[PDB]
Amino acid sequence: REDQYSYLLYPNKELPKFLDKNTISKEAVSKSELLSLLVSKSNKQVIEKDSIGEYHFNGEFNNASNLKQALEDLSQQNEYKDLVAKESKTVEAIFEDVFNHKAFTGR
Amino acid sequence: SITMDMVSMNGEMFYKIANNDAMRPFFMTIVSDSNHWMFVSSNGGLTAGRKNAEYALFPYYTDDKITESADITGSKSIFQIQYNNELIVWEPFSERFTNKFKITRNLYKNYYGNKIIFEEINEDLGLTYRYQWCSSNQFGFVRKSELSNHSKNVYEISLLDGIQNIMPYGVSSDLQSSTSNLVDAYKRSELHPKSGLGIFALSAIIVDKAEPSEALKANIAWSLGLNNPKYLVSSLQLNHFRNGKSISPEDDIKGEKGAYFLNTVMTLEANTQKEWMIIANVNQDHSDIIAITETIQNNKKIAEDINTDIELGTKRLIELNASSDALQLTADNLRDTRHFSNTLFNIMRGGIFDNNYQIEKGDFSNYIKKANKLVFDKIDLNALGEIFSLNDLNEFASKQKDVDFDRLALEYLPLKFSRRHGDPSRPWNKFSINTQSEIDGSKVLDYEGNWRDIFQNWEALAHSFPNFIDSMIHKFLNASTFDGYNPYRVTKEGFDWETIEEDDPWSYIGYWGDHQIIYLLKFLEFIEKHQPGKLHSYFESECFVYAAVPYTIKPYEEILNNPKDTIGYNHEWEKVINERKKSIGADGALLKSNDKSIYHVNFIEKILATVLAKMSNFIPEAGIWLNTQRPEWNDANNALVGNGVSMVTLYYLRRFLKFFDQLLENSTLENIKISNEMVEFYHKVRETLMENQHLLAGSISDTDRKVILDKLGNAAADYRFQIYNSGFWGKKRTHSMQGLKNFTKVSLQFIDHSIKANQRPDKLYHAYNLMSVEKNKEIAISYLSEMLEGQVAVLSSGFLSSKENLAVLDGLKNSALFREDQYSYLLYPNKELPKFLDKNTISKEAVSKSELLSLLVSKSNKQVIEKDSIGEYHFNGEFNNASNLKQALEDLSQQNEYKDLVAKESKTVEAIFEDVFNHKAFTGRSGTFYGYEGLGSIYWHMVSKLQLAVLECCLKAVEEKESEEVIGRLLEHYYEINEGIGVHKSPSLYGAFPTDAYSHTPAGKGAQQPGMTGQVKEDILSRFGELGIFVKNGCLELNPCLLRKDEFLKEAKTFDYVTVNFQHQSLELVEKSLAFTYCQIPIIYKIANQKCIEVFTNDGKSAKAASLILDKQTSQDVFGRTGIINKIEVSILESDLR
Amino acid sequence: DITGSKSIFQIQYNNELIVWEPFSERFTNKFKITRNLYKNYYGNKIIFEEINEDLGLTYRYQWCSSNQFGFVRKSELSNHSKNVYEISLLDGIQNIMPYGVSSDLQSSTSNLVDAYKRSELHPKSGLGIFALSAIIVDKAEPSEALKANIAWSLGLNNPKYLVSSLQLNHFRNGKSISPEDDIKGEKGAYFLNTVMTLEANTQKEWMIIANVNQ
C-alpha cells in the first residue's frame, strides 16, 4: 500500500456495486421451467423481474440456505411441487453462479 | 416571545410556535396513515423509518440522544452567500454560529399531525429557509425545501443541503445502539449518476456466523428541483463547506456514515423563492431501486405524483379518524384539533374497524380456521357472500346451532391500524406498525394489546360503532379465567399470558388487581344504555367459556403466611394446552370439562366468577387485598403487592354491584344455573356476609376482620383447588334468582360500610391501605398518603351524594395534590427526600449500646459499619437493603472473633438498619424518583379520569335538580380541571404543542412522552359528555347542559366531513352554530328560540320534534351506520348554554 | 459539546462583552484560533490548548491521574496580550455520571436514568455530589444508593457553583448565572463561575478533582 508504504493482509479488491451484485442472466431464466413459471405468475419468493426486464434473487436472501428455505415454502403448494423436486439443484446452481459463495473465506 | 397561532402555509392550516428555540426542545411523533414512524425533536433531531426500528432511516436511540444528535443526524443545510465582496456562511438550525446573526426560528405542525415545518429567518440577510417532513406510502419520507429572499438584494448562493447519518438497510437496532463503530466498517454509500439517487447499504449483513451474508437491500435518497447538482454521499466534506470552501462530488464512500447532500450554485433574485425536495425510503431491493431510477429519468410528472401521494396520505388519515368521529368544527380550533389527535392516538393504539360493520369472508374464514379446526370443517360458509354485515353474520350464526361458532362469530372484530406504543421516550416498549402485508402491501386485519390498554381504547371506540359492544364483551368475558382473572394480552387469535424466565428467582407471573371490574363495567353500562334487555338474554345462554391460563393461585394459609409468594406457573397444564392447541387451534386454550372438549357457562356464572374472586379478597374496612404478584394501575407503587389493600377497586366494585343489582331487579327470571363446583363457593361467601351483617351497626374489630377474611379466602381456596386438580365435571345446578339478589344486596351493605370507614378528615378518601396479621388472630389496618386515584374512584363509585362529591373535590383542590404552576393534580404529595449526606447515619447511642457494632468499630472492620473522620457512623455503602446487611452478617459469622456475637445481636442490627432507612414504609419507586409517576409529576391519564368522574358527578347533580350553588360549584371544578389539561396553555407552559397529548409533566420540565397515552380515551368520552351526547333506554339524546356559549361560531365556516360511505362532503355552518359527528353522522347545534331536533334522511325527507330525545328506532338507525340518516340538526336554547 | 470539559469566558473589551468558548464548535470562525494537543513521554498526561490570537489569550487544561484523589484537571488561563481584561469565566465538567448506573442501562436507557438523578453541592466545601435517588432495579423492593461520584476544586476565590448544565446557554449568550445546590432529574455537572481581572503577561491557575465510587 503506497500511501503508508506498508503491507495489506491480502489484496484490496473492488466489490460489486449494489446494482451489480444480484442479476440473473436472461438465458438462465428462459432455460428454467421453474423460474419462468414464477416470473409469469408474478411470484417473488425466489425471483423478481424489474421494470427494465432484468432478473434478481429475492432481496431477503443472505445465502443459499434462505434460497433452500424458500424452495421448501414453494413445494408446499401444488402448482410448484413437481417442479421444486425436479429443478431445485439447478436453481441452487444458478444462485451459486451469481454469488460465487464457494470462494467465501470470511468477512 | 413564544406565541402559538393558526397560519396558512401553502394553502394548508398549521399551528406556528414562534421562537420555538426559546423553549427547551420537546419531543413529537409525526403520524402517518401508512406504516411510517417519525419521532422528532423541536430542534430537528430525529429518528424515522417504516414498520419498526429494524428499518430505521435514522438511528433509533432514546429521546435524549435523538435531541442531542441534531448537528450530526438528519437535516443539515449550509449556505455560502455572496454579499458585497464578502462570502458569508449561514447554517440554519445549527448551533455552529452562535449569535453570528439575528435569527428567528419558527416551528409548524398541521391540524392532522402528519406534517411538520422547520423555519429559520435570517433577519440580517432577509433570507428564510424552510424544510417540511411529509409521508408517502409509495415514496417514503419527503423533505420539501424552500429558500426565500424577502430582501431588496440579489444573492449568489452556493448551497449544501441534505440529510446525514443515514442508516444502511439491515442493521439491527440492538447492534446500532451498542456497536455503532463496528457497523461503520461495513457501510458503502453509492450514487447512481444517471438519476442522482443515493444507495445506502452494507457490504455484508453483520452476523456472528462464519458464512456468507449478502446484503441485497438498501435505504435510498433522491431529489428533484435543483439544476445540475453535485452530490455528496457522506458528511466528510461538510466542514470544508462550512469554512467557505468548495466540495468535490462523491459517488462511492466506504467505511463512513451515509449522507445525501446536494450542492448547487444559483442567483436568488429579490422577492423570489427557490424550491426542491428530497425523498428517502427504506427496505428497497434491486427492482424497487430501478423503478425509482426509471421514474426519475422518464416520468416528467414525478414531482406531481409525489405531491399527489402525500395528499392521499392525508385523505386516508382523515377517513380512518373521521370513522371514529374525529371531526368537529367549533369556534375553538384548539379543542377541535385536540379532539382529532385524541381520536387518532386512540385508534392507533386500540385499532379502528375496517369498514363500518362490513366483514370479508376470506379474513373471517381464516380466523375460524386458526380458532377451531372442528368448527371450521363443520360450518359451511357458502351462504355468505364475499362481503357481509355483522347482522348477516348474526342471522347466519342463529341457523348453525353451534355454540362454539356463535362465540367465535360474536368475538370477531375486524380492527386494523393498531400498534404497540413504543418510541424513544418509551424505549422499553418494542413497537411495530404491521398495517401493510409483507406480501403485497394490502391492509392487515389484526390486533394485539395489553389487557387494560386495549379495553380502555375500545370503550371510546365503541361509541362510534355501538353494535360491536357485544363482540367486545364476549371477547373480555371469554378471555377471563375461572378463578376470576385474565391473561396480560389479547389478540385477534385469542390471548397470550406471561411465562417464567430460565430458573431466574426474580421472574414471576400473576394477575393485575384492577383488570377485571372497572373495564368490564364500562362495557356493561354501554350495552345496557344502547340495547336494554340484551344482557338479560345472555343470563341463561351457555355460550361463554373460560380462558385456561396455567397459573396456580396457592392455598389460603400459604398466601396469608407470605402474600408476596402466591402464584406458581403450572408447566404440566401448559403441556396439555399446547397439545390441545396443536389439535383444535386457539380454542385449545379454553377449559375443557369431563364430558365436553370445551366447557360452556352462562353470563350469570361469568359475573359470579369475577365477583366472588374479588369478594374472596375483601378485607372489611380495608378494601380488596393485593396478593396476585402484580400491582393495579400504578406500576410505580408495585411494592404494595403483598400487604397492600385496594379501596380503589372497592369503589369501582360498588358501582359494579349496584349496576348488577339493578340489572337483576329488572329481570323476570326466577332461577340461575351455575357449575356444581361453584355452588359451595357462592353459598359460603353469601352465608359469611349474611351472618356477619349485624357487625355493620358499628366499626368492625381486628378479630372479626380476620374471622371474615378467613371464611371468604378459604372458600375461594377450596374452589380453585378442586378445579386445578379434578376440573369442571360439566354438571350445573339450579338456584334462586332471589338468592343472587340477596348476595348482591348484602355485598353492597359490606362495601358501603367499608367506604364509610375510609373517609379522611380533609374529606378525601383512602386509595390504598396496608394490612398486617397480628397475634395469628387479628388483621390490623393502617393508612397511606392522599392519592388522586382514590378520589377519582370514589367520585366514580355512584355512592356519594352530590354535596359529598363536592366536599371531596373542595378537599382535593385544597390538598397537597394540587400543583400551582400547571393548575392540575399530582398522583400523591411531593416530598423532600433526604440529601445524600443525610440518608445513612447511625446514632452514636445505638452504636455504643451494641457490643457487635462497637467491636467492628474498634477493630476497623468496614463490612457492616464505618466511622467517618468526624466521628459519625454509617452503614457500608454497598447496602441497598436489609438483604445485603444479612448477607454481610453471614460473612462475619464465618469468622471466630464475630461468630457468637452475630447469632446474639443480628436481629438488633437489622432493627437499627430499619430505623435508619424506614424500608417498612416503601411502596415502590413512586416515592424515590422525579419523573413519570414519581415525585412532583403530573400523570395526565389520571387527571383526565378525574375530569370524566367530575363530569359524571355534574350530570348527577343536574339530573337530580340540586341547588344552583351545588351544580355551579361542581361545574367550577369541572371547568378548572379541564383547563389544567392545558389545551389553552401557552406552548412555553405546556412544553409542546398543546393540541398533542403527553403521558406526564414532571416538576422541572414540560410535557414528556408524546402520543399514545390512555388519557385520550377519557378526553373523548368527556368531550361527548360536554356536547350532551347521552344514550339511555336505547335512545340517543342530544341535549347539552355543560356546553359553553363561546364554543359557537362567531362567523360562517365550511364543515368538511366524511360520510359512512367514504364520501368527502361539506356543510355550510352559520354564526351561532357548531358541528361534530356521532357514528359518522354530521350533527349541527344551532342556537334558537325553541328546542327542536331535525333528522334528515337519504330519501330527501326530514322529520322534526320539540323533544331532543330520539326514539329507539331512529337511534338504532344512527348506531347502525346504514347511511339512512344524512345529518341531524339540533336547535338549542341560549339559556341552556354556560 | 455536552460531555466532559467545558469552558466559557465572558471578556470585557472596550465597552463590549465578548464570549469565547475554547474547544467548542459553537462560534465557528468567530476568532482566529490555534489548537494544540500535548501528550507526555510517559503517556499518563494530556494537555488541550487553545490560543485565541485575536485576544492574545490562551486556555489550557490537562488531565492527570491520582491514586488517592481520582482525576485531576489542571487549568491555566494565560494573558499574553498588552491588554487588561475583566473576565467572568464558567469552567467545569458536564454529563457527570452518578454512581451506580450499569453501563448497559446507560447505553440503552439513558433517559430513564435522568429521572433518578440528584446533584447536590456541599456549601462549606464547594464539593459536588452526583448520585441517584435509588439504584435502578427491576425488582419491587427498596434500593438505596449509598455512594456517589464527586467533583471539587481549588484555586478560585469565592466561586458560584452550578451542579447542572441548565444555565450553560444563558452564560453562552452573555447573561449571568444563579448558584445551584440541588438539581433533580438532570445530567450532573460541576461548574465554577468567578470574576477576575487578568493583567497583561499574567496567568491564572486552578484545578478540578473528580473521583468515583465514594
Ligand SMILES: OC[C@H]1O[C@@H](O[C@@H]2[C@@H](O)[C@H](O[C@@H]3[C@@H](O)[C@H](O[C@@H]4[C@@H](O)[C@H](O[C@@H]5[C@@H](O)[C@H](O[C@@H]6[C@@H](O)[C@H](O)O[C@H](CO)[C@H]6O)O[C@H](CO)[C@H]5O)O[C@H](CO)[C@H]4O)O[C@H](CO)[C@H]3O)O[C@H](CO)[C@H]2O)[C@H](O)[C@@H](O)[C@@H]1O
Ligand atoms: O395559576 C394558579 C391558580 O390557578 C387557578 O386556576 C385557574 C383556572 O381556574 C382557570 O380556568 C378557567 C375556569 O375556571 C373557567 O371556569 C368557569 C367556571 O368557573 C364557571 O362556573 C360557574 C360557577 O361559578 C357558578 O357557580 C355559582 C356559585 O359559585 C355561587 O355560590 O352560587 C351560584 C348560584 O347561587 C352559582 O351559580 O355557576 C355557573 C352555572 O350556574 C357556572 O357556570 O362557568 C364558566 C362558564 O360558564 C367557566 O368558564 O373556565 C375558563 C375558560 O372557560 C378557564 O380559563 O384558568 C387559569 C389559567 O388561565 C387558572 O390559573 C386556581 O383556581 C388557583 O387556585 C391557583 O392558585
Ligand SMILES: [Cl-]
Ligand atoms: Cl414489549
